[PDB]
Amino acid sequence: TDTIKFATEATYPPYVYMGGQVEGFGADIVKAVCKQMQAVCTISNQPWDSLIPSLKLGKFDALFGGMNITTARQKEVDFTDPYYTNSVSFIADKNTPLTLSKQGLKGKIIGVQGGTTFDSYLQDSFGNSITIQRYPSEEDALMDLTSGRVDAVVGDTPLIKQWLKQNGRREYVLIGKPVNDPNYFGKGVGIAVKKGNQALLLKLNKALAAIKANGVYAAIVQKYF
Numbered sequence: 001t002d003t004i005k006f007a008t009e010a011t012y013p014p015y016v017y018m019g020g021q022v023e024g025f026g027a028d029i030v031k032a033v034c035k036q037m038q039a040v041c042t043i044s045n046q047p048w049d050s051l052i053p054s055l056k057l058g059k060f061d062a063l064f065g066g067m068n069i070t071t072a073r074q075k076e077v078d079f080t081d082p083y084y085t086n087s088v089s090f091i092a093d094k095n096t097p098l099t100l101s102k103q104g105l106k107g108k109i110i111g112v113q114g115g116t117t118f119d120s121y122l123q124d125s126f127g128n129s130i131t132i133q134r135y136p137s138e139e140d141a142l143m144d145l146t147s148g149r150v151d152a153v154v155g156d157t158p159l160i161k162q163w164l165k166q167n168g169r170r171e172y173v174l175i176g177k178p179v180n181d182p183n184y185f186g187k188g189v190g191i192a193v194k195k196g197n198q199a200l201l202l203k204l205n206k207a208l209a210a211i212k213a214n215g216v217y218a219a220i221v222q223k224y225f
């Protein structure tokens with residue numbers, strides 16, 4: 001559709017991040033679909049909480065950036081077909097990037113609410129490579145994270161973000177881990193457009209399918225994953 005404005009908050013590696021240009025897996029997917037569509041595009045970096053309101057007001061045409069498709073979000077916006085698996089977010093101090101793998105988290109302590117699906121996911125995906133500390137609640141896990149007693153926390157992101165905001169901690173940020181274990185697959189990550197924008201949605205879906213078909217998608221995946 002010749003001109004398309006995308007927005008994200010560039011704070012979620014490896015999906016999106018700051019290279020003063022937005023970079024990352026999602027940024028490359030967006031550039032690739034735009035090329036496929038013969039569209040001219042920009043990616044704007046804006047506060048996470050402003051994105052959906054701005055999409056609804058029509059300031060942007062599309063949102064992306066490690067955005068998990070969820071039933072709740074599907075009530076507010078329309079998503080494309082997913083272009084990668086869903087992400088489990090780890091919350092950690094921004095001063096130290098983490099590689100979210102068995103080797104990258106070697107010697108780290110990860111806090112989690114005990115007995116939850118997040119706890120099971122950590123056990124299955126990391127096994128004995130990490131130390132898991134379990135808490136009665138996400139708040140208790142965060143009390144340890146933000147006093148330096150664990151390295152990262154895994155839990156419900158909207159609740160965690162709410163806690164961090166209420167308690168005036170901007171120091172802690174999210175890192176995305178793609179879920180490769182089919183037992184924990186969700187709908188995936190997708191590009192969001194304004195609810196009812198069927199024309200753009202169809203164009204984006206066709207473009208995503210086309211980059212999958214011509215090898216462009218596979219090369220982008222190989223770059224990051």
Ligand SMILES: NC(=[NH2+])NCCC[C@H](N)C(=O)O
Pocket residue numbers: 008009010011012016048064065066067068069087088089157174176
């Ligand atoms: N661009 C970003 N800051 N993305 C954060 C995404 C966090 C999480 N995956 C979610 O779907 O809510």
